[PDB]
Amino acid sequence: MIYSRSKLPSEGEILIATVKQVFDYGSYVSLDEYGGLQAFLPWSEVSSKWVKNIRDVLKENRKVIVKVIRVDRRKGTVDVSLKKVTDDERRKKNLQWKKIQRLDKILELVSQKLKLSEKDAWEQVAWKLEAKYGDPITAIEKAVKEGEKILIDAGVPEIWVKPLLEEASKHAEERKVKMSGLITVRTNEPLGVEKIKEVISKALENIEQDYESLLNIKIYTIGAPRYRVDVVGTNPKEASEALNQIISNLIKIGKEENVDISVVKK
Amino acid sequence: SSEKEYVEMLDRLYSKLPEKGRKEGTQSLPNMIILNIGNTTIIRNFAEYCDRIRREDKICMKYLLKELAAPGNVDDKGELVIQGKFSSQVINTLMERFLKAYVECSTCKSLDTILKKEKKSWYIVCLA
Amino acid sequence: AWPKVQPEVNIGVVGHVDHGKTTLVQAITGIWTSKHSEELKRGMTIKLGYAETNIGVCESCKKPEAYVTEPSCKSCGSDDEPKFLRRISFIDAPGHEVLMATMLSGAALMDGAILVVAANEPFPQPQTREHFVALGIIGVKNLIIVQNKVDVVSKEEALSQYRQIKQFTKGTWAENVPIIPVSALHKINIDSLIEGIEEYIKTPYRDLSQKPVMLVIRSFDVNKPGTQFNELKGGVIGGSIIQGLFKVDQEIKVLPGLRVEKQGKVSYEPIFTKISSIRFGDEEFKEAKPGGLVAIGTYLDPSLTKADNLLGSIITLADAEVPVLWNIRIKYNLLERVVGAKEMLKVDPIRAKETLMLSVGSSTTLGIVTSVKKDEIEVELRRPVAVWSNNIRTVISRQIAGRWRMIGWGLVEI
């Protein structure tokens, strides 16, 4: 399961919870992100006056996305909305959720591995990363590319980071796919190859920073006038997107230094 | 440094010619295969020409001379004990199959470069 | 042992006997010009028979045996170390269809010649008699006629086999040209031929203060398929520097260059680039001089060389003042009967508006005739050939650079 350093959520936040019992007034639910922090969903925040049947709309153990709109720091009282929740955060919280499930599993792995527990794994990894650079799920994919400095620059206690990086790099290489375009470069200059290498570098410069997903890129030569571009990352859009941004920059920066570069029309 | 008197340089050739008189070829008596027609055929003298090239030559004599599924090497005398795919009386077989693959005879006879139409480390990694 | 130098002399191998001329090379150098380990070593550098070997002398010893090639004094039979003289190179000239079409590049590509005899036949051959005078046409006065394939012959096969040559020599220019009997297969009496090369084919004067001029006979892409952009190397332009002095990190230019359509009119504009590396055979030097086939790495887009594209053209320095001319004035020449494999008397004359192949260095330009005199011919070349200072011996023909269709020659009045 998922634990949380903050026992009580912030107001307006979008979370995820699994129905436990849709009995009386509304429906009682449990936020799986706080360990099972028992929340609550008033019937008035389901749908509309569209002839409501909360008996089936919310079924036992059906995980759904809500939004906290009521918080009392006495006992609990965590009233949440359903359809009055921003239905674009529908894709938002759903996607982050995928990454949170990922984090849990990889956390469970490393933790169950050595003499750790889910209690300690979060308490020493996710917690400390939360206090460094936003959500850990994204700061972890950052560490695997930069090194082991990322986790010590968060507070992580010494030499159990490596198990994390060894196990995290596992899941990333599993979900490997490649998007590759085709170009042709033919420039005639005093130092042609020097320009060819220089312009490709100008285009590629600062692309992995904006497009966060990729692991590595290779613009190697295939023929003599034609060259291949390879992008390998863990995201469909990111790959095909970054790939085109590269190629567009190749053409744009190309004519700036008199380097003819065109995308193969095949 | 000579005109018509260059004969003594040409004599240097016909004097270094007896330095290369009878080398490249066959001498004292070639085929040692005898006339046998039993089940297949086995030479009574194959375990003497073996050392009259170099060593055991299992990956040479028996290795090269073998057709299909040819059983049997040389522990006694001869080979091809059963099914040699070479059951005959051809006294001339050990001459053409070893006309390139000798051991050690290239295209000079004295002393040369010993093994040098049939190689393998000439293509994998250039040694020379 | 001896210093690591570059070839300073180019020797031409001219014969007719199959492999006879070829084996004679390996007899001196030892480099196989049949099945090569040159294509299997780098990329695809394979045109003519290019061999090279050092030449030293085991002084304090008799001859012909002191003159050795390797630092091992095992030829003279001694545990000593000779003096170094020079490194020489040879050209088998197999190529592609060429049986004479190679010797039209100049003189710095072949500073000396060795005419290897055939073997059983009386004297001349379909090739021997053909390109014999081809040495007295392009400019080779220092020649060595060798009596090879005498592997199995007699003294009587020299009492007239050698005296037959003295007749063929008496009637032209090459009179007292040496005739050395050498063993084809066996490396015997080769010492004599070596001593011969060292006497009758000396190292011509090299003026290293003139405009650097290399004749490009090859060019290609050295990079392998898959090479990352960070490890891409420039184009390779292996030619034969005919004069001047080329160094690494020097600025050059490829003439004539490229075609440029510029509002009605087209021209050929140079290709300025830098010298990355120099490579004589397999050893990397820092400067190249005339004599010896040199491979020059550059900073050019491999798409310009790759498929031997940059073949034909020549290379100078960025600053050159070199006239790359369309039309040219050519003083043609009256050659006899010409095509040894058909065989006639005179030949088809040179008319106006006729298409002919002018082999300028290694260029196959087709220029329609425009003017005809007695010793002058104005041409309408397709590609603007480049001239540096002196007139070029372009062996005119018709079709392409090959044995098929040969006719006349002549310089290039400039």
Swiss-Prot record, chain A:
What's the superkingdom here? Archaea
Domain S1 motif intervals: 12-83
UniProtKB keywords: Initiation factor, Protein biosynthesis, RNA-binding
Provide one Gene Ontology biological process annotation: translational initiation
**Which Pfam families does the record match to this protein?**
EIF_2_alpha (PF07541), S1 (PF00575)
Q: Name one GO molecular function term.
A: RNA binding
SMART domains in alphabetical order: S1
Functional note: eIF-2 functions in the early steps of protein synthesis by forming a ternary complex with GTP and initiator tRNA.
Q: Hey, which family's this protein in?
A: Belongs to the eIF-2-alpha family.
On assembly, the entry states: Heterotrimer composed of an alpha, a beta and a gamma chain.
Protein known as: Translation initiation factor 2 subunit alpha
User: What is the species of this protein?
Assistant: Saccharolobus solfataricus (strain ATCC 35092 / DSM 1617 / JCM 11322 / P2) (Sulfolobus solfataricus)
The major lineage groups are:
Archaea, Thermoproteota, Thermoprotei, Sulfolobales, Sulfolobaceae
From Swiss-Prot, chain B:
Check the UniProt entry and state the signal peptide residues, or none: none
> Oligomeric state and partners?
Heterotrimer composed of an alpha, a beta and a gamma chain.
Protein name per the record: Translation initiation factor 2 subunit beta
The record lists its disulfide bonds as none
Do you know which InterPro entries this protein is assigned to?
A: IF2/IF5 (IPR045196), TIF2_bsu_arc (IPR004458), Transl_init_fac_IF2/IF5_dom (IPR002735), Transl_init_fac_IF2/IF5_N (IPR016189), Transl_init_fac_IF2/IF5_Zn-bd (IPR016190)
Q: Which organism is it from?
A: Saccharolobus solfataricus (strain ATCC 35092 / DSM 1617 / JCM 11322 / P2) (Sulfolobus solfataricus)
The terms under GO molecular function for this entry are: translation initiation factor activity
Q: Which family does it belong to?
A: Belongs to the eIF-2-beta/eIF-5 family.
Curated annotation (Swiss-Prot), chain C:
List positions binding Mg(2+) 1: T22, T45
Residues recorded as binding Zn(2+), renumbered to this chain, are C58, C61, C73, C76
Which EC numbers does the record give?
3.6.5.3
What residue spans carry the region label G5?
Answer: 183-185
Q: Which InterPro entries match?
A: eIF2G (IPR050543), eIF2g_C (IPR015256), eIF2g_dom_2 (IPR044127), eIF2g_GTP-bd (IPR044128), P-loop_NTPase (IPR027417), Small_GTP-bd (IPR005225), T_Tr_GTP-bd_dom (IPR000795), TIF2_gsu (IPR022424)
Give binding positions for Mg(2+) 2.
Answer: D18, G43
The UniProt entry, under PROSITE patterns, shows: G_TR_2 (PS51722)
The UniProt keyword set, sorted, is:
GTP-binding, Hydrolase, Initiation factor, Magnesium, Metal-binding, Nucleotide-binding, Protein biosynthesis, Zinc
Which top EC class applies here? hydrolase
Segments for region (G3): 92-95
What processes in GO biological process is this protein linked to? Answer: formation of translation preinitiation complex
Give GO terms: molecular function aspect only.
Answer: GTP binding; GTPase activity; metal ion binding; translation elongation factor activity; translation initiation factor activity; tRNA binding
The record, for NCBIfam families, names: eif2g_arch (TIGR03680), PRK04000.1 (NF003077), small_GTP (TIGR00231)
Family (UniProt): Belongs to the TRAFAC class translation factor GTPase superfamily. Classic translation factor GTPase family. EIF2G subfamily.
Protein name per UniProt: Translation initiation factor 2 subunit gamma
Which organism is this protein's natural source?
A: Saccharolobus solfataricus (strain ATCC 35092 / DSM 1617 / JCM 11322 / P2)
User: Gene symbol?
Assistant: eif2g
